[PDB]
């Protein structure tokens, strides 16, 4: 039972945030990748050498790239490798595989480490390039109950978050109470917000909340500030009659995963009601 593979063509590879690209791949026509919301594929790369200076980083994000001297990096790979990336589209969005891919730069305290192999390769891709994906795979699946669902996301965790939420509202036509809580550093780091706002207008049972930890003055931000674990508690769980009866679905950067799960455990939520997708 060898894993299925598809050679896909790159449609677009646009920044959605300073350090996240939306890689959109065209599935070969007439074919289906039979994935589930929350699932993922693997991408492979050939041997290559790519310069960060050749990345298509748009106007709104170049100042930070220049500030951290990121355009100097080069990534050289002599052997093919594989990495997993989660679908941001949901299964009824046919014909494409949408990914959200964080650029895995060298650590700040070890800035001369090799850049991340597969994310650097992905960020080098241009429309018309070909990439081979394999799978699909999955473990981060929704529980099918009537319980309230609480989705918490950060960074590239937006991908399974979007997949899950669209799957509930558009394919399952779910009437369950569903809320999505997304933490980001500032306004330019938020994406897909218009989609979720439209979903909230069309689905009374769905609500969407963004917390910005470090909003810029020019963001003109009057929404919630701080970290998403505190915003979720202070603006919702603190007067929820029974948070323990909720299903929590977590996917963010490690610091956010830990802080949210600690908050939930401190509320008495049982491990069985907390599902984590750790990238
Ligand atoms: C099921 C699953 C789903 C995932 N979904 C997503 C997703 O949707 N989006 C996403 O962006 N990621 C996702 N990930 C993570 C993804 O698979 C990769 O791990 C990620 O892209 C980084 O891989 P890389 O090849 O770019 O970096 P790697 O080459 O694996 O390097 C990782 C980090 O280590 C650093 N490093 C390397 N060598 C050294 C050294 N000597 N000293 C110090 N530091 C060093 C690199 O600079 C880099 O920051 C997922 C992972 C899993 C398991
Ligand atoms: C990681 C991250 C990404 C985007 C926006 C904010 C954050 N920071 C977080 S979630 N910090 C958690 C926290 C606060 C105190 C202890 O842990």
Author numbering: 127 to 405
Give passages from the manuscript.
Here, the development of the Fast Fragment and Compound Screening (FFCS) platform, an integrated next-generation pipeline for crystal soaking, handling and data collection which allows crystallography-based screening of protein crystals against hundreds of fragments and compounds, at the Swiss Light Source is reported. One of the first academic collaboration FFCS projects was performed on protein crystals of two homologous bacterial enzymes. These systems functioned as challenging ‘real-life’ test cases for our pipeline. The two crystal systems relied on different precipitants, PEG and high salt, and both crystal systems had to be adapted by a distinct post-crystallization treatment to cope with the addition of large amounts of DMSO in the soaking procedure (Stegmann, Sharpe et al., in preparation).
For both projects, the 500 most diverse fragments (selected based on the structure descriptor FragFP) and 50 project-specific fragments were selected from one of the FFCS pipeline fragment libraries (Maybridge Library Ro3, Thermo Fisher). Once the soaking conditions had successfully been optimized, for each of the studied crystal systems two to three days of intermittent laboratory work were sufficient to perform soaking and crystal harvesting (∼250 crystals per day). The X-ray diffraction data sets were collected on beamlines PXI X06SA and PXIII X06DA either manually or with the SDU software. Data sets processed with adp (with the in-house XDS-based gopy pipeline) were fed into dimmer workers which calculate F o − F c difference density maps and generate fragment coordinates. The entire fitting and evaluation method will be described and exemplified in detail elsewhere (Stegmann, Vering, Steuber & Fritz, in preparation). The hit rates for the two example projects were very similar, at 6.2% and 6.4%, respectively, and showed well defined, tightly bound fragments.
